[PDB]
Design a protein around this ligand. Sequence first.
Ligand SMILES: Cc1cc2nc[nH]c2cc1C
Ligand SMILES: [Mg+2]
Ligand SMILES: [Zn+2]
Length: 289
Amino acid sequence: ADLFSADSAYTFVQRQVNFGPRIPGTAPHRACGDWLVATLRSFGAAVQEQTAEIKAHDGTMLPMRNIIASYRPEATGRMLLMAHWDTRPVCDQDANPAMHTETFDGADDGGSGVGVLLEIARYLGQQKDLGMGIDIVFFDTEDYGSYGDDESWCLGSQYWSRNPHVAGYKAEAGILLDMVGAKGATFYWEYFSKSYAPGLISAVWQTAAALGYGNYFIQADGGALTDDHVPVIKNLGIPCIDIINYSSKNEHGFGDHWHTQRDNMQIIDKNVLDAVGETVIRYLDEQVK
Ligand SMILES: Cc1cc2nc[nH]c2cc1C
Ligand SMILES: [Mg+2]
Ligand SMILES: [Zn+2]
């Protein structure tokens, strides 16, 4: 199956990275956001932006910019796809205490999910007579928190889930992609995903298995990860899963590149992007019925 161009997704990641770090409040962030909006529109999506001024953990006032792209916005049966598009300002997990004040590319952490969903949006824009509405949401200000302070992360998704772009917004299911591009990635059952959306997690992991991606989508418990999907679950009641590279066997749970200078384009593996994208596209295809 090649409904999902791995080369194209890779290129989308590289473009994001070549803007420079998409750090909230900086010029590369603004330019990359403009480009994301324009690209989604070029793929036939109706795109709107949700802006707000939000207070970070350190009092910094961030210009949150969520990006919402919709196909068939009038349809009542909807599918939701999510990723965060900001970059963490500092790679304060670098295994070199000197780099805890510098910037990293966020190729996997932010770039990968956005790239996969941009390629999926291209695919969808080529479809005529979609069977369901589809919303692609790029959350801002996901990666600006402090460790141990759970509420300081996922600010864009908190805001959107508490203030959706349409009153009573509902989708049948939600899929969040987070760090879905690194070589050797392992996608285990994230706890909140399986606890609140067991049917969706089963369907997606079995879809991946059927496609030959059981080496990436492992049918075993992973971590309990408070990601952008949890506010959506809690405040909108949408069953959401999180496809995220994480393993308790990793020193940090997340890949060793996470929040280091090594989260750059050299960590990206086209085959991982392809596994995730082919899986998600096949699931969508079998849901628009
Ligand atoms: C702490 C944390 C950091 C992240 N960075 C990208 N996704 C993330 C998810 C969590 C839960
Ligand atoms: Mg493919
Ligand atoms: Zn991060």
